[PDB]
UniProtKB/Swiss-Prot annotation:
Keywords: Acetylation, Angiogenesis, Cytoplasm, Developmental protein, Differentiation, Growth factor, Heparin-binding, Mitogen, Nucleus, Phosphoprotein, Secreted
The family this protein is said to belong to: Belongs to the heparin-binding growth factors family.
Motif range (Nuclear localization signal): 14-17
Sequence segments annotated as region (Heparin-binding): 117-133
Matching SMART domains: FGF
Gene Ontology biological process terms from the UniProt entry: activation of protein kinase B activity; anatomical structure morphogenesis; angiogenesis; branch elongation involved in ureteric bud branching; cellular response to heat; epithelial cell proliferation; fibroblast growth factor receptor signaling pathway; lung development
Impact upon substituting Y99A: No effect on integrin- and heparin-binding, loss of FGFR1-binding, defective in inducing FGF1 signaling, cell proliferation and cell migration
Residues bound to heparin: N23
PTM entry text: In the nucleus, phosphorylated by PKC/PRKCD.
Broad class of the protein's primary localization: secreted
Keyword field contains tRNA processing: no
The protein's name in its UniProt record: Fibroblast growth factor 1
Length: 142
C-alpha cells in the first residue's frame, strides 16, 4: 500500500511547535482568513502549530491561534480549514536523517509535499518532489 518510506523523526506532539524551512528561512504560517504562507517573523502569532497523530506516521497540523487545519486541495494548494476533512492529513517523515517533511496523505502517490519557496510563498503540490530544499522543515519549540 505505502507509496513512501517510513523513517520517522524523533519527537512528540506533547507541545506545539514552529515549522521552520531553511529554503528561505520562513516559518510556515496559517493566517486568519485561511491563507497559508511563510514569514520570517518569529513573533508572528499564526506560526504556532500544534501537531497531533492519527495513525502512526500521520499528523494534523493545527494553528493554535485560530483553530484552523492545514489542508491541501486537489490542485495541490495549501489552505486553512476550520475543521478537518479528507485532505488535512499529512505523512510526517524524516528526510536526510535530519529534517522533517510533510506529504499529503490523500495525494501521497503524486509526491505532493508541504513546502515554502525562497520568497516566502507556499509551493504548489505539483511543483514539489523529493530532494527540494523547499520541502525540508525543522520542528522548533515555541
Amino acid at each position: 500500500h505505502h507509496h513512501h518510506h517510513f523513517n520517522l523523526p524523533p519527537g512528540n506532539y506533547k507541545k506545539p511547535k514552529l515549522l521552520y524551512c531553511s529554503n528561505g528561512g520562513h516559518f510556515l504560517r496559517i493566517l486568519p482568513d485561511g491563507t497559508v504562507d511563510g514569514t520570517r517573523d518569529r513573533s508572528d502569532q499564526h506560526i504556532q502549530l500544534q501537531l497531533s497523530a492519527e495513525s502512526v506516521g500521520e499528523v494534523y497540523i493545527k494553528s493554535t491561534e485560530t483553530g484552523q487545519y492545514l489542508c491541501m486541495d486537489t490542485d495541490g494548494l495549501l489552505y486553512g480549514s476550520q475543521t478537518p476533512n479528507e485532505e488535512c492529513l499529512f505523512l510526517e517523515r524524516l528526510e536526510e536523517n535530519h529534517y522533517n517533511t510533510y506529504i499529503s496523505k490523500k495525494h501521497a502517490e503524486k509526491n505532493w509535499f508541504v513546502g515554502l519557496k525562497k520568497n516566502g510563498s507556499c509551493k504548489r503540490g505539483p511543483r514539489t518532489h523529493y530532494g527540494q530544499k523547499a520541502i525540508l522543515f525543522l520542528p522548533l519549540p515555541v
